[PDB]
């Protein structure tokens, strides 16, 4: 008539040790079984917690936070025992988080993380414990026959968890289970403690048993059919129904009812979707006021540059002060001033120190304030970039500038970010490894007892394409179905690989970024650590950490901004000779004829994004003369636009062929003037699809961002309301309707796939600098690009060819001139970077330089080796150096020196 049983012990694959099903499928299973509630109690972690809350909301199930543990106490010796801890409330959730972090921080061995039982004295309130059945403190001791020991245990829970500790009973046809229960029942009865049924769940369906066994062998490193393989699981450990459970425990309805009682007792709030900002350093002045002070000051720099130093300014300056007012009042009203301040500061620090930040910027850049703060470097009014596409007062959201830097610099930024906000408020972020296509076949093959060669035959048939799946591999490679039909072993293989594909095997590897908290990180996420209790990371990954409301900064391997950096040093050092102030890649005008000519010719080698094949043949196929269609580029180079035949209409519509209309040949208006000029008529962007709601029908833009999302969330009722609000507002703004109910019909299909222009222009700018640099500073730019590609000998040779094809001097290796990096001669000739000689490397190079900077230096081969410290200049390095042509201006050719090297190396050691 209502709930009889909810599951209080369940692993998903985040347990890693075991488990099969992910977090959302368990939640649906529980929902389909008609349960109101569901604990996922993964093994010493809460990795899936944020995903659990999201999925529960969506399905009408209440999440019960908890975790399983190996537990250790003096009473049982070195024998580890099982406990389940549930969080009944938010005090409990915190203690549970503190536990898990304590297990990990302590370090651990082959046995895995463990907690000491005595930790459960301080870390207590708000937790409910389940005994662990036959493998718990109390269960093992009942099994013994040691009445006393049972008592010294039972006393501990009586002292510390008075009505908060349950004798767990489990019927999964495992050994000692039915003896334990029978004793535990007698214990509860006698000592007056409560019992609870659990099914110790590991997989959704009984038939998944074999898949889970395999999953475990892969973790444990055993072959399926090894007699020594630990077999700790039963086919019974599946997501059993309410009916199935009441039948299993019919003799003890209290064990079931206590399920339901515990579930009602557990209510943990996990707020999602909203920041907990940390506090910015502000001294006096409210956070709200400091933002306006520095946003206004910022705008003072931007206004003097843009509309330059002559006092016209005021001619369209009001529009600027105007828009900043609007944003400042929204940011402040929504609680975000600190978010801008802390990105603001960070971005400045990285410009100041030696850290390039990726383009990214999110949908920011539509924010005048960001530009004022120099978080972004485009003028949003110039390119009709919208603030409301980034922060909309009409909607609950988290503004994200999607800022990222390269992982290698992690140590530096954590350092600084910990100056700002405090050591333990700062932390790295976990990443998980899953078993993709190739790996899962490799591993299931191993487990099923095949030799490498057998299994590898199937693996080679899996394409290497990123994000490849088995289903797709079966689509693209006709040999896969073929052999799957022919070979039972091969089909057994793949059948199981298919159940294991995508399961979580472990943590990185490496972190995914850094997170910043308002206080201690453990007030927000638990910690995971390695065997040594080191490399602490939050147990919630990137996305999860986000949605829990921490400010985060991702890692990215993005050599593009590092190149721009290097070339920029190279340009700015040529200033010391010239002078001529230093360059600000930001003071670049975005209307440079010589750069646009360069683009129009389509020599876009080494220029961000558009260096592909098809791109060079669309640059040419339309010839962009301004910055505004640089933005357009990446929106056009897409499968969808050309599938319909939209790009075609664009390239003609410029010059071109045909004729300007706002938008369609018939269906057009004049007030759509400024909104479509930059894009030659066509609605190219989402920004513009809001803007035509705004000036035709008159939406507040905030309102217009909503219409757009509705056209995204196509459902009749939301759209029918808006279908008339547009149609009524067309008369309100005046005049001609009827036309409206047709331009609206098709603006709803120019925005079905329109680009995020603010996103587009973030990247376009970085491309434009890259273009500029090449046009204006070829020697330095190409130098820098060559420095980034130094690992790959083949790409370097491709680049020198490019250098010579664009007509630049490129000098092969020389020991007297060359450096590590690749640079520019006093004569503007690229000097080869010795790093580019595979095999040498930074140490030996470094050494050579320091020796050259000591006595000019380097008559012949002998002169070097004699000075150079031997074994820091390994003979291995001297052959490599010889054989590149480093000494070819200064005496004998390669061969003759390879027969002189031996002797050269004896005259040194003196």
PDB file of C-alpha atoms in Angstrom, residues 113-258:
ATOM      1  CA  UNK A 113      42.336   3.003   2.434  1.00  0.00           C
ATOM      2  CA  UNK A 114      41.125   2.158   5.957  1.00  0.00           C
ATOM      3  CA  UNK A 115      39.560   4.068   8.874  1.00  0.00           C
ATOM      4  CA  UNK A 116      40.276   3.459  12.530  1.00  0.00           C
ATOM      5  CA  UNK A 117      37.064   2.724  14.490  1.00  0.00           C
ATOM      6  CA  UNK A 118      38.171   5.328  17.128  1.00  0.00           C
ATOM      7  CA  UNK A 119      37.862   8.037  14.430  1.00  0.00           C
ATOM      8  CA  UNK A 120      34.112   7.355  14.721  1.00  0.00           C
ATOM      9  CA  UNK A 121      34.269   9.006  18.176  1.00  0.00           C
ATOM     10  CA  UNK A 122      35.108  12.515  16.995  1.00  0.00           C
ATOM     11  CA  UNK A 123      33.467  11.987  13.593  1.00  0.00           C
ATOM     12  CA  UNK A 124      30.071  10.994  14.915  1.00  0.00           C
ATOM     13  CA  UNK A 125      27.073  13.207  14.974  1.00  0.00           C
ATOM     14  CA  UNK A 126      24.533  12.768  12.223  1.00  0.00           C
ATOM     15  CA  UNK A 127      25.740   9.366  11.036  1.00  0.00           C
ATOM     16  CA  UNK A 128      23.813   6.079  11.018  1.00  0.00           C
ATOM     17  CA  UNK A 129      25.905   2.878  10.928  1.00  0.00           C
ATOM     18  CA  UNK A 130      25.107  -0.495   9.478  1.00  0.00           C
ATOM     19  CA  UNK A 131      26.997  -3.388  11.095  1.00  0.00           C
ATOM     20  CA  UNK A 132      28.601  -4.936   7.998  1.00  0.00           C
ATOM     21  CA  UNK A 133      26.868  -8.252   8.469  1.00  0.00           C
ATOM     22  CA  UNK A 134      29.142 -11.272   8.662  1.00  0.00           C
ATOM     23  CA  UNK A 135      32.201  -9.125   7.755  1.00  0.00           C
ATOM     24  CA  UNK A 136      31.647  -6.507  10.457  1.00  0.00           C
ATOM     25  CA  UNK A 137      33.115  -5.841  13.897  1.00  0.00           C
ATOM     26  CA  UNK A 138      30.264  -7.686  15.533  1.00  0.00           C
ATOM     27  CA  UNK A 139      29.596 -10.335  12.896  1.00  0.00           C
ATOM     28  CA  UNK A 140      33.078 -11.839  12.795  1.00  0.00           C
ATOM     29  CA  UNK A 141      33.061 -12.087  16.556  1.00  0.00           C
ATOM     30  CA  UNK A 142      29.652 -13.769  16.681  1.00  0.00           C
ATOM     31  CA  UNK A 143      31.027 -16.236  14.198  1.00  0.00           C
ATOM     32  CA  UNK A 144      33.905 -16.970  16.547  1.00  0.00           C
ATOM     33  CA  UNK A 145      31.890 -17.797  19.677  1.00  0.00           C
ATOM     34  CA  UNK A 146      33.711 -15.155  21.699  1.00  0.00           C
ATOM     35  CA  UNK A 147      30.840 -13.701  23.791  1.00  0.00           C
ATOM     36  CA  UNK A 148      33.220 -11.243  25.523  1.00  0.00           C
ATOM     37  CA  UNK A 149      34.640  -9.682  22.371  1.00  0.00           C
ATOM     38  CA  UNK A 150      31.157  -9.163  20.879  1.00  0.00           C
ATOM     39  CA  UNK A 151      30.404  -7.196  24.090  1.00  0.00           C
ATOM     40  CA  UNK A 152      33.455  -4.897  23.949  1.00  0.00           C
ATOM     41  CA  UNK A 153      32.383  -4.051  20.374  1.00  0.00           C
ATOM     42  CA  UNK A 154      28.663  -3.706  21.055  1.00  0.00           C
ATOM     43  CA  UNK A 155      29.575  -1.437  23.988  1.00  0.00           C
ATOM     44  CA  UNK A 156      31.417   0.886  21.600  1.00  0.00           C
ATOM     45  CA  UNK A 157      28.309   1.496  19.440  1.00  0.00           C
ATOM     46  CA  UNK A 158      26.080   1.687  22.523  1.00  0.00           C
ATOM     47  CA  UNK A 159      28.361   4.415  23.863  1.00  0.00           C
ATOM     48  CA  UNK A 160      28.737   6.373  20.615  1.00  0.00           C
ATOM     49  CA  UNK A 161      25.770   5.646  18.281  1.00  0.00           C
ATOM     50  CA  UNK A 162      22.856   5.007  20.723  1.00  0.00           C
ATOM     51  CA  UNK A 163      20.020   4.649  18.221  1.00  0.00           C
ATOM     52  CA  UNK A 164      22.116   4.961  15.206  1.00  0.00           C
ATOM     53  CA  UNK A 165      23.668   1.513  14.746  1.00  0.00           C
ATOM     54  CA  UNK A 166      21.873  -1.394  13.007  1.00  0.00           C
ATOM     55  CA  UNK A 167      22.655  -5.071  12.912  1.00  0.00           C
ATOM     56  CA  UNK A 168      22.765  -5.556   9.141  1.00  0.00           C
ATOM     57  CA  UNK A 169      21.336  -8.823   7.738  1.00  0.00           C
ATOM     58  CA  UNK A 170      21.997 -10.064   4.192  1.00  0.00           C
ATOM     59  CA  UNK A 171      20.697 -13.136   2.298  1.00  0.00           C
ATOM     60  CA  UNK A 172      22.706 -13.538  -0.852  1.00  0.00           C
ATOM     61  CA  UNK A 173      23.529 -17.230  -0.517  1.00  0.00           C
ATOM     62  CA  UNK A 174      27.080 -16.539   0.617  1.00  0.00           C
ATOM     63  CA  UNK A 175      28.888 -18.630   3.298  1.00  0.00           C
ATOM     64  CA  UNK A 176      28.473 -17.911   7.005  1.00  0.00           C
ATOM     65  CA  UNK A 177      25.614 -15.467   6.053  1.00  0.00           C
ATOM     66  CA  UNK A 178      22.774 -17.496   7.524  1.00  0.00           C
ATOM     67  CA  UNK A 179      24.680 -18.400  10.693  1.00  0.00           C
ATOM     68  CA  UNK A 180      25.545 -14.718  11.277  1.00  0.00           C
ATOM     69  CA  UNK A 181      21.964 -13.570  10.778  1.00  0.00           C
ATOM     70  CA  UNK A 182      20.750 -16.241  13.166  1.00  0.00           C
ATOM     71  CA  UNK A 183      23.228 -15.053  15.796  1.00  0.00           C
ATOM     72  CA  UNK A 184      22.662 -11.348  15.094  1.00  0.00           C
ATOM     73  CA  UNK A 185      18.932 -11.834  15.512  1.00  0.00           C
ATOM     74  CA  UNK A 186      19.648 -13.409  18.873  1.00  0.00           C
ATOM     75  CA  UNK A 187      22.023 -10.513  19.664  1.00  0.00           C
ATOM     76  CA  UNK A 188      19.485  -7.789  18.815  1.00  0.00           C
ATOM     77  CA  UNK A 189      16.735  -9.610  20.698  1.00  0.00           C
ATOM     78  CA  UNK A 190      18.941  -9.947  23.782  1.00  0.00           C
ATOM     79  CA  UNK A 191      20.792  -6.601  23.705  1.00  0.00           C
ATOM     80  CA  UNK A 192      17.744  -4.723  22.319  1.00  0.00           C
ATOM     81  CA  UNK A 193      19.361  -3.442  19.140  1.00  0.00           C
ATOM     82  CA  UNK A 194      17.622  -3.020  15.800  1.00  0.00           C
ATOM     83  CA  UNK A 195      18.098  -5.099  12.648  1.00  0.00           C
ATOM     84  CA  UNK A 196      18.083  -4.051   9.039  1.00  0.00           C
ATOM     85  CA  UNK A 197      17.967  -5.936   5.714  1.00  0.00           C
ATOM     86  CA  UNK A 198      20.354  -5.026   2.969  1.00  0.00           C
ATOM     87  CA  UNK A 199      21.065  -6.773  -0.267  1.00  0.00           C
ATOM     88  CA  UNK A 200      24.702  -5.654  -0.638  1.00  0.00           C
ATOM     89  CA  UNK A 201      24.010  -4.741  -4.259  1.00  0.00           C
ATOM     90  CA  UNK A 202      26.675  -4.714  -6.951  1.00  0.00           C
ATOM     91  CA  UNK A 203      24.849  -4.767 -10.258  1.00  0.00           C
ATOM     92  CA  UNK A 204      21.395  -4.044 -11.607  1.00  0.00           C
ATOM     93  CA  UNK A 205      20.377  -7.452 -12.949  1.00  0.00           C
ATOM     94  CA  UNK A 206      21.250 -10.945 -11.741  1.00  0.00           C
ATOM     95  CA  UNK A 207      22.400 -11.813 -15.283  1.00  0.00           C
ATOM     96  CA  UNK A 208      25.099  -9.099 -14.953  1.00  0.00           C
ATOM     97  CA  UNK A 209      26.857 -11.406 -12.434  1.00  0.00           C
ATOM     98  CA  UNK A 210      29.397 -12.743 -14.957  1.00  0.00           C
ATOM     99  CA  UNK A 211      30.140  -9.223 -16.244  1.00  0.00           C
ATOM    100  CA  UNK A 212      30.893  -8.082 -12.694  1.00  0.00           C
ATOM    101  CA  UNK A 213      33.063 -11.135 -11.977  1.00  0.00           C
ATOM    102  CA  UNK A 214      35.065 -10.161 -15.048  1.00  0.00           C
ATOM    103  CA  UNK A 215      35.136  -6.549 -13.899  1.00  0.00           C
ATOM    104  CA  UNK A 216      36.618  -7.719 -10.589  1.00  0.00           C
ATOM    105  CA  UNK A 217      39.250  -9.996 -12.125  1.00  0.00           C
ATOM    106  CA  UNK A 218      40.444  -7.134 -14.194  1.00  0.00           C
ATOM    107  CA  UNK A 219      40.926  -5.099 -11.058  1.00  0.00           C
ATOM    108  CA  UNK A 220      42.374  -8.009  -9.011  1.00  0.00           C
ATOM    109  CA  UNK A 221      44.729  -9.091 -11.818  1.00  0.00           C
ATOM    110  CA  UNK A 222      43.459 -12.679 -12.055  1.00  0.00           C
ATOM    111  CA  UNK A 223      42.213 -14.921 -14.821  1.00  0.00           C
ATOM    112  CA  UNK A 224      38.519 -15.792 -14.635  1.00  0.00           C
ATOM    113  CA  UNK A 225      39.072 -19.505 -14.168  1.00  0.00           C
ATOM    114  CA  UNK A 226      42.040 -19.450 -11.831  1.00  0.00           C
ATOM    115  CA  UNK A 227      41.107 -21.603  -8.762  1.00  0.00           C
ATOM    116  CA  UNK A 228      42.971 -19.101  -6.607  1.00  0.00           C
ATOM    117  CA  UNK A 229      40.724 -16.215  -7.684  1.00  0.00           C
ATOM    118  CA  UNK A 230      38.825 -14.710  -4.748  1.00  0.00           C
ATOM    119  CA  UNK A 231      35.111 -15.312  -5.292  1.00  0.00           C
ATOM    120  CA  UNK A 232      33.367 -12.931  -2.945  1.00  0.00           C
ATOM    121  CA  UNK A 233      30.236 -12.210  -4.951  1.00  0.00           C
ATOM    122  CA  UNK A 234      26.951 -13.939  -5.579  1.00  0.00           C
ATOM    123  CA  UNK A 235      24.425 -13.662  -8.490  1.00  0.00           C
ATOM    124  CA  UNK A 236      22.003 -12.602  -5.787  1.00  0.00           C
ATOM    125  CA  UNK A 237      23.664  -9.222  -5.292  1.00  0.00           C
ATOM    126  CA  UNK A 238      21.442  -7.459  -7.817  1.00  0.00           C
ATOM    127  CA  UNK A 239      18.889  -4.707  -7.627  1.00  0.00           C
ATOM    128  CA  UNK A 240      16.121  -6.852  -6.108  1.00  0.00           C
ATOM    129  CA  UNK A 241      12.454  -5.656  -6.034  1.00  0.00           C
ATOM    130  CA  UNK A 242      10.356  -4.693  -3.013  1.00  0.00           C
ATOM    131  CA  UNK A 243       8.367  -7.932  -3.336  1.00  0.00           C
ATOM    132  CA  UNK A 244      11.558  -9.954  -3.721  1.00  0.00           C
ATOM    133  CA  UNK A 245      12.902  -8.499  -0.481  1.00  0.00           C
ATOM    134  CA  UNK A 246       9.765  -8.858   1.702  1.00  0.00           C
ATOM    135  CA  UNK A 247       9.701 -12.508   0.700  1.00  0.00           C
ATOM    136  CA  UNK A 248      13.400 -12.954   1.578  1.00  0.00           C
ATOM    137  CA  UNK A 249      12.989 -11.462   5.046  1.00  0.00           C
ATOM    138  CA  UNK A 250       9.396 -12.490   5.787  1.00  0.00           C
ATOM    139  CA  UNK A 251      10.520 -13.946   9.129  1.00  0.00           C
ATOM    140  CA  UNK A 252      11.813 -10.517  10.208  1.00  0.00           C
ATOM    141  CA  UNK A 253       9.590  -7.690   8.895  1.00  0.00           C
ATOM    142  CA  UNK A 254      11.478  -5.331  11.258  1.00  0.00           C
ATOM    143  CA  UNK A 255      14.604  -5.664   9.178  1.00  0.00           C
ATOM    144  CA  UNK A 256      12.583  -4.347   6.241  1.00  0.00           C
ATOM    145  CA  UNK A 257      10.602  -1.644   8.014  1.00  0.00           C
ATOM    146  CA  UNK A 258      13.895  -0.325   9.421  1.00  0.00           C
TER     147      UNK A 258
END
